């Protein structure tokens, strides 16, 4: 559990000012400092603001911080798409032996780009994998925006929830998102149905792909 309180998520459109609160108590923020860390996707955290309002060398001044009482605030002025990241506040708590306390982190989403329906690609189990007595359906989902999708699997027309693994969406170089989903079956289950479908729902619209043993 996290001993600082910050909102799990924040959002803004490019150019907007986004502020992130970080609430502590008198034994951390009250009598110490607030520092902030930015964690880009797939990256290590980096120091963004220290000692309430100081910017490390190389951090643009559109990032600012403040502290008041037992709480602090991170302000991201002139929000940019690359500001999409997790932001962590931190403080040194002096209760008993002293320990670093952290916020639970705030995911900032920057909504700056036009909507894009997903491209869906569904692969059936290969003959090789069937010969290995296994079967995996692979549903690749790319080029969607915003980065929220839900995946539903169908055997003929019945939902399938067992043996499903789907990855969290991540941003590609084309600034759109991608995800993947897996349906594990036995070869007999695969052959015992006329078709299987990967149904991807994005912003209230569903894109479907279907494969058949034959």
């Amino acid at each position: 559990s996290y001993e600082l309180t910050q909102p799990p998520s924040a959002s803004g459109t490019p150019g907007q000012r986004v502020t992130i609160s970080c609430s502590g108590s008198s034994s951390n923020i009250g009598n110490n400092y607030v520092h902030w860390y930015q964690q880009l996707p797939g990256s290590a955290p980096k120091l963004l603001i220290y000692r309430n309002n100081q910017r490390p060398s190389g951090v643009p001044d559109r990032f600012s911080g403040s502290k008041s009482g037992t709480s602090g605030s991170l302000a991201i002025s002139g929000l940019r798409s690359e500001d999409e990241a997790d932001y962590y506040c931190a403080s040194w708590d002096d209760s008993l032996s002293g320990h670093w306390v952290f916020g639970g982190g705030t995911k900032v989403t920057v909504l700056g780009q036009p909507k894009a329906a997903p491209s869906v690609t569904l692969f059936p189990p290969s003959s090789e994998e069937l010969q290995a007595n296994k079967a995996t359906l692979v549903c690749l989902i790319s080029d969607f925006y915003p980065g929220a999708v839900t995946v539903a699997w169908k055997a003929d027309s019945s939902p399938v929830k067992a043996g499903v693994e789907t990855t969290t969406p991540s941003k590609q170089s084309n600034n759109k998102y991608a995800a993947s989903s897996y349906l594990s079956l036995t070869p007999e289950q695969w052959k015992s149905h006329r078709s299987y479908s990967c149904q991807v729902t994005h912003e209230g619209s569903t894109v479907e792909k279907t494969v058949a043993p034959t």
């Binding site: 996290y2 520092h35 120091l47 040194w92 320990h99 491209s119 692969f123 790319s142 991608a178 993947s180």
Partner: protein, 235 residues
Amino acid sequence: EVQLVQSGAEVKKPGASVKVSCKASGYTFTSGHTFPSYDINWVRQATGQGLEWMGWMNPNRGNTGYAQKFQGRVTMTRNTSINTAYMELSSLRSEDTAVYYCARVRSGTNYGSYYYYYYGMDVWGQGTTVTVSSASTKGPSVFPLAPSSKSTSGGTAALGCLVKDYFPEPVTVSWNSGALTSGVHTFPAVLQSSGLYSLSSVVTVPSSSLGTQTYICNVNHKPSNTKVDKRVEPK
């Protein structure tokens, strides 16, 4: 310039212990009464979760302070002659699966027995993944994801490789030995209830080249010292 470089990924069984190293460069690791004094702290993060403090170590005298959660199974040391700090975590449970970071912070001020920090963690190592699982290392089976007319749009075709049932992370996938980078996407891995990972790498190529160009995915799973090359063809 200042850099913290950590040792490589680790895989361990429940009950084991792991020792992670962190080599500092770009500044003088110890003060010697002249250079600015910096401690090495350690912070870990399970995938999709927050930051969790483990402890601090002043490399000048080697004194330490550990978070209450890890007291009794953690040890932070350093070899000053090679600018390297170490973190050793014992009695590994699966909940210890996480990325372990070392981080630098200006040494605190002593108030008797009490340590006070007034600066942020200003440089972080690249992290080291520690995987704690009862699974044993296993190389992947690579299956082709063959393009058909169903995997084809306009003039482009999607083809790929399914990298199935390996442990632990990671695998890297290249295409045509690195020569093919455009249109290549390697997806994050899933962890199946078997404790084994799987992932896919896919390429979008012009459908016309399916009869003229060869496509090979090169799958490398260094933890098991396994390299697979698989040619993906249309039928």
